[PDB]
């Protein structure tokens, strides 16, 4: 039973470990741990929030330069974004009504998006400049991702997907 | 130092409640007091910089509705901000060249921002719009913080920016 006092050193010990990476009195302990852990818990959904923000900005500067085709706002830009980004920018411009693609360059490898918020397919669109950006894609409806090898101009870009405008859909 | 026998049990108590917020074993607590720790001051930081790109993207879409007053733009706007907000903008606005006033509703109040990355001293102009909302602010020679009790139009707000534009120029 002389092991008895040498776990109660064992506890001693913790707490104030703990206590200390904190720079609290080990009576205040608790109470600081407990705040800490909650703004941990706001700071990871505000982080999260704000990123929604960014890609919404971010979506609406993308509309600022769109251009016409029957009533219908075409979007077509090359951006700074990882994948996971093209894909929250997509969306976001498909629920606008928007149609076009986004292009952004990845190490090794293009990133190609697609989105369409008419009844023209994503998938259809994302295919048609695949074949002329040598790479392949699928998804859905109204979004699709994509990877390529060439990365093209607003122009080249524009024009691809105009033809698909005027002929896949009228 | 029976006052003690229990002062030890306290720590014993202090020790299992730290341990139980941030659901762990108490033996492996210091552990995770130090993760989240790290986790915690991570995220402030990372907040700290999704703010700035929110900045960085809003002002960029507030040029693209400036007028221009002798070639000069000139950005008047109410904005969704807070006065951290405004200020972060205000000085985007005022490093790419601009002049004008950002307003914000807040609680009880009107929250007040002017910049120019012109000639132009941007107290003059705040002390200018504040004359008109009823209120006051101040700040350096490019932007200025102040508050106000009248929200203002964007009408009234340009109003005020181009008189004041057109008294220093002429």
Same mark, same amino acid.
């Given at each position: 039973?002389?092991?008895?006092? #040498?776990?109660? !050193?064992?506890?001693?010990?913790?707490?104030?470990?703990?206590? $200390?990476?904190?720079?609290?009195?080990?009576?205040?302990?608790?109470?600081?741990?407990? =705040?800490?852990?909650?703004?941990?818990?706001?700071?990871?959904? #505000?982080?999260? =929030? /704000?990123? $929604?923000?960014?890609?919404? %900005?971010? &979506?609406?500067?993308?509309?600022? =330069?769109? !251009? #016409? @085709?029957?009533?219908?706002?075409?979007?077509?830009?090359?951006?700074?974004? +990882?994948? *996971?980004?093209? *894909?929250? /920018?997509?969306?976001? /411009?498909?629920?606008?009504?928007?149609?076009?693609?986004?292009? &952004?360059?990845?190490?090794?490898?293009?990133?190609?998006?697609? @989105? $369409?918020?008419?009844?023209? +397919?994503?998938?259809? %669109?994302?295919?048609?400049?695949?074949?002329?950006?040598?790479?392949?894609?699928?998804?859905?409806?109204?979004? &699709? *991702?994509?990877?390529? *090898?060439?990365? %093209?101009?607003?122009?080249?870009? %524009?024009?691809?997907? @105009? =033809?698909?405008? $005027?002929?896949?859909?009228?």
């Amino acid at each position: 039973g002389e092991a008895a006092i #040498e776990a109660v !050193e064992e506890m001693e010990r913790l707490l104030r470990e703990a206590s $200390s990476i904190l720079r609290v009195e080990p009576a205040k302990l608790p109470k600081t741990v407990e =705040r800490f852990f909650e703004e941990w818990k706001d700071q990871r959904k #505000e982080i999260e =929030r /704000l990123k $929604s923000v960014i890609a919404d %900005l971010w &979506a609406d500067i993308l509309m600022e =330069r769109a !251009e #016409e @085709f029957d009533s219908m706002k075409v979007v077509a830009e090359v951006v700074d974004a +990882d994948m *996971q980004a093209l *894909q929250k /920018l997509a969306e976001r /411009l498909a629920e606008k009504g928007a149609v076009g693609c986004l292009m &952004a360059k990845g190490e090794g490898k293009v990133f190609v998006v697609t @989105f $369409s918020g008419q009844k023209y +397919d994503a998938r259809e %669109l994302l295919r048609e400049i695949g074949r002329v950006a040598k790479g392949s894609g699928g998804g859905r409806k109204d979004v &699709a *991702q994509g990877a390529v *090898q060439q990365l %093209l101009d607003r122009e080249e870009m %524009l024009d691809v997907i @105009f =033809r698909f405008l $005027s002929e896949h859909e009228g």
